[PDB]
Scaffold this active site. Structure first.
Site, mmCIF file in Angstrom:
data_model
loop_
_atom_site.group_PDB
_atom_site.id
_atom_site.type_symbol
_atom_site.label_atom_id
_atom_site.label_comp_id
_atom_site.label_asym_id
_atom_site.label_seq_id
_atom_site.Cartn_x
_atom_site.Cartn_y
_atom_site.Cartn_z
ATOM 1 N N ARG A 134 0.813 -1.195 0.000
ATOM 2 C CA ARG A 134 0.000 0.000 0.000
ATOM 3 C C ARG A 134 0.855 1.257 0.000
ATOM 4 O O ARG A 134 0.473 2.272 -0.583
ATOM 5 C CB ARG A 134 -0.931 -0.018 1.198
ATOM 6 N N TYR A 161 -15.423 6.168 1.920
ATOM 7 C CA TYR A 161 -16.421 6.262 2.978
ATOM 8 C C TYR A 161 -17.561 7.215 2.604
ATOM 9 O O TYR A 161 -18.597 7.249 3.270
ATOM 10 C CB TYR A 161 -15.766 6.734 4.277
#
Length: 680
Positions: A76, A217
């Site tokens: 990541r 989100y």
């Protein structure tokens, strides 16, 4: 000390929002992974090759995580850094580049890059600038730390003074190479204002907008606006790193991921609209960015040069690759441009996803739930007489116990057998348990404790005596190997994670092993967690799928072979090799429903996720035809199905028992159990 008191004050505040966050997990990687990696891939190193720390400024504590969450979070950091690299390498050396981190949180990325002490970011020392954007409250705290932490102030030009304090507590900061700007990203219009206040409209400045799990989100409409607002800044890149649910909200891993975030009251919303990789492409095209280069974490993993993987594999003990596969497929790295001058060189380009094939439904056999809550993964099991025996495994801890399974049409009964000997096999998983001695005894081969603790002690269990006996021991340790009793009563042994021969033969009566690696270039590499059965009738056996010890490659081959019992140098010979994408499985189990139909079950794949149509299939070895045994929408959605660590037992019916996965710290899942019956 006035400064030190301030530092600690907001240091604690930063913590109330760091643990079980991505920052915490990056600190983990910073502690374990970065010191064990060579220049290329440590991101943070001084002139004398001493590792430099940055994530410690927001999360000082020694953080620790499973070997699966860690490799993921190394992928990541390497995701963002590989993309930023491609941009810095290609953009002319005099142009000003601006990295704008959308919802940066406590991400120290700017400082990792701006620090002249870090020679692994020298290409960022001169002409790169950074804008941090997040909620006002959060940036206040983050700025307190930037000011009161000398090592940080040093980087961006603020004064380092034990005897100076800035009590203003503002939500904004302005320096030549770093600014922080408050903004509620859900307010498209305040954001668009901000873009201009920051003069990001200037076409002579290259923009790199980074959305690392933040616009994930937000509701599709709220996030799509952020994306679109930036597309109107001439010469801009958009880098988005976030979740995918490639096969719907009911894929075994997907189910758990969404549910986890719901609990944390931070649902994944955007992913609901944008399930797959291609879904992201059309999205970015529609929203301004016409040039898109996108793939999931596993394409990024294959992308690493072999010198890098070798180091990674040696960082920490690791053996949860079915989990790694799933996780990887549920995270996308998407690189977008609104100018065509910028080229995605082959160094960074992601190959387009190869179309999936539709398969013919199997007309003979079907799936029907059959509860077998043995509640354990990675043991093995074999039939003896009319009895069934499951040994070892983890649940979630490694056990040595033996279970007798009373198989019934609707459910399976379990009784813990009691050992009668003073010595017993140490608790283990990823071994093999095979029937020998005309169904009187059970042979325990290899296995492991922790992934660095491969085992070499084999055993035999006697049903009558209920005693454990340590027989001869394997020269090389071995686990995740495959096994299957041969017609003569002997036991074939396939690959696994080992330094020993690719294929072994254990003569029960003679009590010895025999290296019988076929004379084929295929067996040059030890095949890990493949499928392996033998049919006494058709006088042959199959090897299906399997991975290699680079933890990156996965055979797509179905290998047919024969067994010449009277031959003692080439008992095993390859008849034929079949190829097909749906064979490319790791951690699967195969079995013969009939001499002319091989049940292939479960496992993970480097290519994509298995769905309801192809998680379970069948192949006709002489016809070379593939038929699909579909799982009902019900069993898919309502019950817990995770085909990894499971096993196959038979007594015209094959039960799919045991199995689970911890799903990357999104909680655990247990394979409840299924059965394959003939169709009425």
């Amino acid at each position: 000390n006035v400064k030190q008191e301030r530092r600690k004050k907001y240091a604690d505040l930063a913590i109330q929002g760091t643990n079980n966050s991505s920052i915490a997990s990056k600190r983990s990687v910073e502690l374990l992974y970065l010191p064990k990696l060579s220049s290329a891939n440590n991101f943070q190193m001084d002139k004398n090759n001493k590792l430099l720390e940055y994530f410690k400024f927001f999360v000082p504590k020694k953080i620790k995580r499973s070997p699966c969450i860690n490799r993921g979070y190394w992928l990541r950091l390497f995701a963002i850094r590989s993309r930023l690299n491609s941009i810095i390498e290609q953009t002319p050396q005099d142009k000003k580049i601006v990295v704008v981190n959308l919802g940066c949180g406590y991400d120290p990325l700017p400082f990792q890059l701006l620090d002249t002490n870090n020679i692994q970011s020298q290409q960022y020392h001169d002409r790169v600038s950074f804008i941090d954007i997040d909620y006002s409250d959060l940036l206040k705290i983050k700025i307190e730390l930037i000011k009161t932490i000398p090592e940080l102030s040093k980087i961006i030009g603020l004064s380092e003074d034990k005897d100076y304090v800035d009590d203003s507590n503002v939500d904004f900061l302005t320096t030549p190479k770093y600014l922080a700007r408050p903004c509620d990203l859900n307010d498209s219009k305040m954001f668009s204002t901000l873009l201009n206040e920051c003069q990001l409209y200037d076409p002579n400045v290259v923009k790199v907008f980074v959305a690392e799990v933040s616009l994930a989100y937000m509701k599709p409409e709220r996030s799509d606006s952020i994306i679109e607002a930036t597309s109107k800044m001439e010469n801009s890149h958009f880098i988005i790193l976030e979740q995918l649910i490639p096969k719907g909200p009911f894929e075994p891993f997907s189910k758990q991921m969404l549910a986890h975030f719901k609990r944390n009251d931070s649902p994944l919303q955007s992913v609901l609209k944008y399930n797959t990789i291609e879904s992201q492409v059309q999205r970015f095209n529609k929203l301004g960015f016409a040039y898109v280069n996108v793939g999931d974490m596993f394409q990024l993993w294959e992308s690493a040069d072999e010198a890098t993987k070798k180091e990674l594999l040696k960082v920490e003990p690791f053996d949860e690759l079915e989990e790694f596969h799933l996780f990887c497929h549920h995270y996308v790295l998407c690189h977008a441009t609104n100018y065509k001058e910028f080229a995605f060189t082959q160094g960074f380009l992601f190959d387009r996803s190869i179309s999936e094939i539709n398969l013919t439904v199997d007309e003979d056999y079907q799936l029907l739930e059959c509860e077998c809550p043995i509640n354990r993964k990675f043991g093995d099991v074999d039939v003896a007489g009319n009895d069934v025996f499951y040994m070892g495994g983890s649940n979630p801890y490694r056990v040595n116990e033996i279970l007798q399974l009373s198989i019934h049409y609707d459910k399976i009964d379990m009784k813990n057998i009691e050992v009668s000997s003073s010595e017993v096999p140490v608790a283990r998983m990823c071994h093999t348990f095979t029937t020998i001695s005309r169904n009187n005894q059970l042979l325990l081969i290899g296995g492991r404790k922790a992934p660095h603790q491969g085992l070499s002690d084999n055993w035999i269990f006697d049903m009558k005596t209920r005693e454990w006996s340590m027989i001869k021991s394997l020269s090389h340790t071995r686990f995740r190997h495959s096994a299957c009793s041969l017609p003569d009563g002997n036991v074939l042994i396939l690959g696994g994670v080992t330094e020993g021969p690719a294929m072994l033969l254990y003569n029960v009566t003679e009590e010895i092993f025999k290296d019988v690696t076929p004379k084929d270039e295929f067996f040059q590499n030890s095949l890990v967690s493949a499928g392996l059965e033998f049919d006494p009738v058709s006088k042959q056996g199959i090897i299906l799928g399997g991975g290699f010890m680079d933890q990156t490659t996965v055979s797509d081959k179905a290998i047919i072979f024969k067994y010449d019992a009277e031959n003692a140098t080439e008992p095993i010979t390859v008849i034929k090799k079949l190829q097909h994408p749906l064979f490319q499985r790791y951690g699967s189990q195969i079995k013969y429903i009939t001499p002319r139909k091989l049940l292939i079950v479960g496992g993970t794949s480097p290519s994509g996720l298995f769905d309801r149509t192809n998680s379970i299939i069948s192949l006709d070895p002489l016809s070379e035809t593939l038929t699909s045994i579909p799982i009902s929408r019900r069993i898919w959605e309502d019950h817990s199905l995770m085909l990894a660590g499971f096993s196959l037992v038979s007594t015209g019916t094959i039960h799919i028992i045991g199995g689970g996965a911890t799903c990357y710290g999104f909680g655990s899942v247990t394979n409840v159990g299924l059965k394959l019956i003939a169709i009425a």
